[PDB]
Amino acid sequence: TQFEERHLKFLQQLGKGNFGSVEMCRYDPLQDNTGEVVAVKKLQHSTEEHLRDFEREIEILKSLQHDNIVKYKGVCYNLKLIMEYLPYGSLRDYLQKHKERIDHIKLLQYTSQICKGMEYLGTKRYIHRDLATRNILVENENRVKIGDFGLTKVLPQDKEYYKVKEPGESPIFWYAPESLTESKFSVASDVWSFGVVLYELFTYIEKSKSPPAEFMRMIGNDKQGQMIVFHLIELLKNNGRLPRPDGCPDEIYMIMTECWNNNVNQRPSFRDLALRVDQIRDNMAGH
Numbered sequence: 001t002q003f004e005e006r007h008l009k010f011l012q013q014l015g016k017g018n019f020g021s022v023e024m025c026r027y028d029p030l031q032d033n034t035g036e037v038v039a040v041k042k043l044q045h046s047t048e049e050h051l052r053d054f055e056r057e058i059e060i061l062k063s064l065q066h067d068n069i070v071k072y073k074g075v076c077y078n079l080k081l082i083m084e085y086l087p088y089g090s091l092r093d094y095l096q097k098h099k100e101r102i103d104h105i106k107l108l109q110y111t112s113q114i115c116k117g118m119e120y121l122g123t124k125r126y127i128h129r130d131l132a133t134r135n136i137l138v139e140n141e142n143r144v145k146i147g148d149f150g151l152t153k154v155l156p157q158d159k160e161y162y163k164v165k166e167p168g169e170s171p172i173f174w175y176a177p178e179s180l181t182e183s184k185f186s187v188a189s190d191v192w193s194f195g196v197v198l199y200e201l202f203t204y205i206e207k208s209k210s211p212p213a214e215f216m217r218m219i220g221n222d223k224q225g226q227m228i229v230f231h232l233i234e235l236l237k238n239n240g241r242l243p244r245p246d247g248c249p250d251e252i253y254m255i256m257t258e259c260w261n262n263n264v265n266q267r268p269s270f271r272d273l274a275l276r277v278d279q280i281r282d283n284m285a286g287h
């Protein structure tokens with residue numbers, strides 16, 4: 001549960017995301033090259049505010065035990081979070097690399113797993129706030145896991161939403177309209193973002209088809225910066241939405257459009273999304 005820095009052998013930089021950085025290391029206390037490979041998360045720049053947020057993130061991950069949630073292994077005290085290493089990396093990269101071999105029934109198997117991991121977060125009153133394929137990891141060809149909790153918040157005991165406005169770049173093209181306008185995050189805004197994840201999956205991460213590329217096309221690429229959010233809010237209010245991805249069945253696009261309801265209370269639950277996705281999977285498989 002306690003890892004010693006001296007036995008953490010650097011192997012490679014895996015990625016960066018919102019003030020965090022993840023590396024692949026071998027934890028080799030015997031110094032005989034038999035230790036397991038682990039993923040290590042650290043702050044790119046240490047500040048008291050980022051350290052307090054990182055400590056809360058660690059406590060959140062340690063509290064989660066689910067097949068579709070990356071496993072917490074421990075800490076290294078320059079605080080570092082030690083997690084299991086997942087050999088296939090992000091679902092965003094994996095899908096882009098294997099698009100010719102991943103069919104719709106496989107995309108739905110991954111979709112169902114993301115729904116189950118999200119419903120489990122919901123039982124703990126945790127709001128992920130950053131659902132996107134870049135934040136989902138691939139354990140093997142048959143299993144994905146929610147792979148980062150850097151923006152995850154715990155709902156207050158007496159409210160169904162949490163208001164936050166973080167400095168830094170926010171993933172506005174995955175945000176629910178009430179998150180853009182009122183900085184309100186909830187299980188319902190995670191469902192909106194889940195709809196964007198489902199869109200990402202069915203586009204197979206085709207560059208010109210990404211949510212930022214499609215929304216910027218609809219808003220106009222000429223739009224400033226501070227004005228992008230303003231125009232995005234107006235577009236969503238007017239029921240402007242990401243288009244049906246090429247080859248996506250109507251039934252699947254309908255799930256996305258239902259997640260993208262402006263009325264927060266009308267969005268489906270993660271339990272109903274899992275039922276719906278599993279029913280469609282069953283239909284496609286015949287059994």
Ligand SMILES: CCn1c(C(=O)N(C2CC2)C2CC2)cc2c3c(ncn3C)c(Nc3cc(C)n(C)n3)nc21
Nearest residue numbers: 014015016017022039085086087089090135147148
């Ligand atoms: C996709 C890179 N990455 C990340 C990562 O940057 N972030 C953001 C926060 C900085 C989280 C995923 C949002 C984490 C992990 C990770 C991995 N295994 C466990 N964890 C925990 C992994 N494996 C792999 C294997 C290989 C070969 N690659 C390329 N990546 N890549 C990761």
